[PDB]
Amino acid sequence: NYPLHQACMENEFFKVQELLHSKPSLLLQKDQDGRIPLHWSVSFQAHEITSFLLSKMENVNLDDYPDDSGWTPFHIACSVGNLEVVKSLYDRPLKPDLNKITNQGVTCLHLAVGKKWFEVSQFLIENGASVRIKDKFNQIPLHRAASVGSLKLIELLCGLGKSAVNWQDKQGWTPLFHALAEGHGDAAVLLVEKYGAEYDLVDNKGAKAEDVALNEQVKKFFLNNV
């Protein structure tokens, strides 16, 4: 039904050449999910197909190609993690808006961080990606770095990125609340000790960050260190 797109998911290069040669108007055809061939080649890390397709998209701004979920090929790239593909998509005539949000309001940085792709996250930040765009649930990337318990990302976001640290989400949780709810004692103390996170804020159910701890061991460890 969408031959070219399929060839991209399966990394059938020779196949992509053939289909495009026959019907060039397929380069930007959108499939049943609003995706163009580049969405898929990027999704399955088909480096050769991606390059090939990009060579034909010199005039294209990726920001104009969100799929049905609002994800452009760039959001897909940042979520998969390969620095080289992200670089390829970035270093072109027209550049992607690093802060473009999906329909759920998330940015590429939210995606790389939540998956713990340090290099990609560092790359976005170093090129101007904001570290405070709030998504539909009022979470910024730091909320995600804390929930996965990545010390590496917390320091990248709060350090190089000068991230806000006390913003509360729709649920009333600051990033600290997230670290403790997921048993990440050291990330929690890192937020408090080194980046000035407050631990007296209360969520919508009146609970404090120390009260949503995975277990009272993490709870004990936290209090014993902040």
Partner: protein, 57 residues
Amino acid sequence: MSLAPEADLDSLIIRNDSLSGAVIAAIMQEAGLRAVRKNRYVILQSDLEEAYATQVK
């Protein structure tokens, strides 16, 4: 079926923590059903966000 490589399931969980396993399963089953209407064997973020939008409240 399976989640697309770029999918982000650990995004639906971070929202209003404290979802029974049951609800998580309902969401996944619901996402899978949405992929089927698209004739896809892989689950995309849209399936997940939509599945969540009608399993939580």
